[PDB]
Amino acid sequence: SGAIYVGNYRVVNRHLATHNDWANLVWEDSSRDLLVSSTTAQGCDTIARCDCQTGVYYCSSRRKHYPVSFSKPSLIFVEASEYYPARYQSHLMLAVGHSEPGDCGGILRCQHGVVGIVSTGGNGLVGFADVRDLLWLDE
Ligand SMILES: Cn1nc(C(=O)NCCn2cncn2)c2ccccc21
Ligand SMILES: Cn1nc(C(=O)NCCn2cncn2)c2ccccc21
Ligand SMILES: [Zn+2]
């Protein structure tokens, strides 16, 4: 689990969004596994505006923050899960690292701020849904 709070927005994995998120929907994209909903309170997270390829992510299944190198956002084939059939996921970044399904929502950060959230993984890889291209999250 996990979410990003910036301005009056909440950014979550689309597969983990709640009924309140869908009723208060701002934008979602199934191919990215992202959903953004509106909030009443101001959030404290800052989104990175950069092309960093090194950062640190939170892995709940190890209670640890791991430093990693990751690929730039790309279109990647992802196998089926209980939430989606096998498909191409867009804006996805991969790193070598541990992850399990319930690690989705863990944040990836670089020196500039929040980069993305855990969305895919297995077999020694972890995949993050990028949010840096969503410039409207800051305005
Ligand atoms: C479109 N929609 N989907 C859900 C949902 O819970 N789906 C299972 C989780 N999921 C997997 N992938 C995407 N979501 C939902 C709930 C309330 C209103 C609208 C909704
Ligand atoms: C981090 N992580 N996430 C998943 C997962 O099932 N994600 C559900 C959302 N999803 C995205 N594309 C398809 N389904 C996973 C599985 C095994 C090991 C690690 C994992
Ligand atoms: Zn950066």
User: Domain spans of the chain?
Assistant: 3-44, 45-139
Cβ distance 71 to 94 under 8 Å? yes
Counting ligands in written order, the one closest to the CA of 22 is 1
| 91 has catalytic annotation | no
Closest CA relative to residue 134, chosen from 116, 111, 121: 116
Atom 7 of ligand 2, nearest CA residue: 120
Yes or no: say if 18 and 102 are a contact pair by the CB < 8 Å rule.
Answer: no
Q: How far is CA 111 from CA 50, 52, 65, 114, in A?
A: 10, 8, 14, 9
Q: Indicate if ligand 1 lies below 6 Å from the C-beta of 112.
A: no
Give the separation between CA 47 and CA 105, rounded to whole angstroms: 15
Place of tokens 């020694």: 124
Please list the residues that pair with 68 across neighbouring strands. 55
Query: Which residues does the annotation place in the binding site?
Result: 50, 52, 110, 112
> Annotated binding site for Zn(2+): which residue ranges?
50, 52, 110, 112
85 CA to centre of ligand 3 in angstroms = 32
**Resolution, Å (one decimal):** 1.3
Nearest atom in ligand 2 to the alpha carbon of residue 33 is: 11
Q: Are 92 and 126 contacting, i.e. CB atoms less than 8 angstroms apart?
A: no
